Amino acid sequence: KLKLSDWFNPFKRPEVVTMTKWKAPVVWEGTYNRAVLDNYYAKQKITVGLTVFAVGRYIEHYLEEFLTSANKHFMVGHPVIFYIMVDDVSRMPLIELGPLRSFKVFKIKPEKRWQDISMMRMKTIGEHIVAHIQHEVDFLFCMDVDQVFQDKFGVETLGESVAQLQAWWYKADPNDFTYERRKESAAYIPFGEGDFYYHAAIFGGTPTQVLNITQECFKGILKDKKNDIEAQWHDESHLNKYFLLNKPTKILSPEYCWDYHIGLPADIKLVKMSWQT
Ligand SMILES: OC[C@H]1O[C@@H](O[C@H]2[C@H](O)[C@@H](O)[C@H](O)O[C@@H]2CO)[C@H](O)[C@@H](O)[C@H]1O
């Protein structure tokens, strides 16, 4: 079966972190052999899911560019199912999908407050995993709609649980991470603890693992809400708590979710997905 040495060469990028202390790969441009992996997973006939939520004007502002870029760049050569969650189905753009892509659309109940928006999104993802996604795909990613694929975002990103390094903080010391710091919050992390600052705009894994991520995050949000507290960065704070306790088996570099407002440092060799404008 697939071994890490079959496809991952950390020595191609010695100026960055490529392996965690728990021996998870951090995937940077140049460290991965996509050809080897494409052939391995083709033989296995895997399908990959992608969930995206879009409410109100986010539909018109972002959803078409997201879908158009994902069709062009996400897991090319492998079956993909787009799970599109919107509040108004009559407003959603119908994009032409390429070979091995298809979609499903669901009408959801929008929530007014950011706390309740993220709360219901983690709950909704878990419900869909149990109802159907666990039957439909081998790997599932959950992404924010307000970003754009720029280049191939492929099977090198698959794993049991996949976290994204947040672009502004990947070089920072953990003491400075914008973790939730009040012990009243379920997302509490003490100063000095933590491995990375993960970005809630991309995460994934097998459907089983993603069910656990979302169920734990939802419980923590709920627990905070019953105590009249709102984590500093809402689901992202709880996600960071979760991945501290349940280490990801693979991490993606900021090449996979890059904010061009930062600039283009030497570390960022080829951008696969960028924050919207
Ligand atoms: O800190 C979590 C929070 O980061 C925001 O991104 C910020 C970044 O944290 C800040 O240091 C920099 O000065 O500006 C960035 C945006 O302009 C994200 O926008 C937010 O989603 C969280 O991930």
Swiss-Prot record:
Substrate binds at F53, A54, V55, G56, R57, Y58, D144, V145, D146, Q166, A167, W168, W169, T178. It comes from the Eukaryota. It catalyses: a beta-D-galactosyl-(1->4)-N-acetyl-beta-D-glucosaminyl derivative + UDP-alpha-D-galactose = an alpha-D-galactosyl-(1->3)-beta-D-galactosyl-(1->4)-N-acetyl-beta-D-glucosaminyl derivative + UDP + H(+). Its cofactor is Mn(2+). It is a single-pass type II membrane protein. Residues 1-277 are lumenal. Its EC number is 2.4.1.87. Keywords: Glycoprotein, Glycosyltransferase, Golgi apparatus, Manganese, Membrane, Metal-binding, Signal-anchor, Transferase, Transmembrane, Transmembrane helix. Mn(2+) binds at D144, D146. GO terms for biological process: carbohydrate metabolic process; lipid glycosylation; protein glycosylation. Its main location: Golgi. Glycans are attached at N212. Pathway: Protein modification; protein glycosylation. The active site is at E236 (nucleophile). The conserved DXD motif is involved in cofactor binding. The manganese ion interacts with the beta-phosphate group of UDP and may also have a role in catalysis. Synthesizes the galactose-alpha(1,3)-galactose group by catalyzing the transfer of a galactose residue, with an alpha-1,3 linkage, on terminal lactosaminide (Gal-beta-1,4-GlcNAc-R) disaccharide borne by a glycoprotein or a glycolipid. Preferentially glycosylates proteins, can synthesize galactose-alpha(1,3)-galactose on glycoproteins but cannot synthesize the glycolipid called isoglobotrihexosylceramide or isogloboside 3 (iGb3). Belongs to the glycosyltransferase 6 family. This is N-acetyllactosaminide alpha-1,3-galactosyltransferase. It comes from Bos taurus (Bovine). The chain holds residues 82 to 358 of 368 of the full protein.
